[PDB]
């Protein structure tokens, strides 16, 4: 896959995760964007996490759709800076 296409795919994941956490769990836009990155990178501090059943389901969907996309994106970014 072209690197720019991978960029678009990870940006779509980031939008999905951020809007979902914001509307389902009620955290600010900024906190939700931070949480999205922390989640799809698999860092998972746990300072923020879903407290509702819908949020838990949503978080599973983000894990399944986002961790692989983020991993490929990081690997492509490696090529362009190294």
């Amino acid at each position: 896959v072209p690197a720019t296409r991978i960029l678009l795919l990870v940006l779509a994941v980031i939008i999905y995760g951020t809007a979902g956490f914001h509307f389902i769990e009620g955290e600010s836009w900024t906190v939700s964007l931070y949480w999205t990155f922390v989640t799809i990178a698999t860092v998972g501090y746990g300072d923020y996490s879903p407290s509702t059943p819908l949020g838990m389901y949503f978080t599973v969907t983000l894990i399944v759709l986002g961790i692989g996309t983020f991993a490929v994106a990081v690997e492509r970014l490696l090529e362009f800076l190294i």
Copy 2:
């Protein structure tokens, strides 16, 4: 391995992790399924974690059997959506 076989293997892991956390640590089915995904993806928020020796042993078995299976499953899912 055929992608559908990998799907069955990760589903077996998810059933194992969910039933085990539910019966050993006493969390709800929904929380246990969420915790299973959070664990085998290596996100590990820590909002849920085993509190008993048996739960800690069980969690190690899920880590050993589940992280690799989940990683292959995510990589295969990448092929079918990208």
Copy 3:
């Protein structure tokens, strides 16, 4: 590397991590073994973590020496069960 050699290497890592956490941070043998797996798998719940400077230094050494070894071990285990 032969799979059995990888097994010995990850077992050495597990012994190192477990004894170190036990003696430096003072947690039980069982908790320390659980924490070692949670750490080198990069799950990182945070229910246990080093509280002392020596423990933090030790944990960095385990992260550097252990995450790669564990990742290769999981990948080899995948070959023998799938």
Copy 4:
């Protein structure tokens, strides 16, 4: 990439993460170095995490720039010890 170049790149990441957490979030140099490793390895205990918007933005930049670099560094270290 030559392994020694990868070493320099991960050291640059470690300096960036450590100084940034120290000055933005106000934690000690030692805690900030520990947190940097815990973050770029994706362990993410959560015993330390950014509490400010600037810290959250900075942490995202470290995640994006650091996880891939650390992963390659660990893989190279594997070659030299195994």
